[PDB]
């Protein structure tokens, strides 16, 4: 057993933004990542509105159907429900806050259809 949980994204990690901010994982606002990506040029936020969410039967797998951009190009991507999706102007969420908080100790809001998910590009 370690002193605390893993330092990567697990609850209590001190996450450093591109603007230099040092904030707890659980407190990071979407605006925090927005700014960090915008202040940077090798990094960027994306606006993908989940239009549908389907369970894939597979263990903890749900495909979030996103409409990428205002041209609403739909992408059906099978993701594990324990993936915490940062949502552009919608909040710090996960497809299953229960599981994300259970396994990673990390609290999340419910990522549901309508939530414009942040796709962030690490160049």
């Amino acid at each position: 057993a370690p002193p605390t949980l893993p330092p990567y994204f697990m609850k209590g990690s001190i996450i450093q933004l591109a603007n230099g901010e040092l904030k707890k994982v659980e407190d990071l606002k979407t605006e925090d990542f927005i700014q960090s990506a915008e202040i940077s040029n090798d990094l960027k936020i994306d606006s993908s509105t989940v239009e549908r969410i389907e369970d894939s039967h597979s263990p903890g797998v749900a495909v979030i159907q996103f409409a990428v951009g205002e041209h609403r190009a739909q992408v059906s991507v099978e993701v594990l429900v324990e993936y915490p999706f940062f949502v552009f102007g919608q909040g710090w969420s996960s497809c299953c806050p229960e599981r994300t908080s259970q396994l990673f100790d990390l609290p999340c809001s419910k990522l549901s259809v309508g939530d414009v998910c942040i796709s962030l590009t690490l160049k």
Partner: peptide, 15 residues
């Protein structure tokens, strides 16, 4: 610290 891209997932390579 950890580089802030630690909890932000990608909805697969978007178009």
């Amino acid at each position: 610290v950890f580089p802030w891209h630690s909890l932000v997932p990608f909805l697969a390579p978007s178009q």
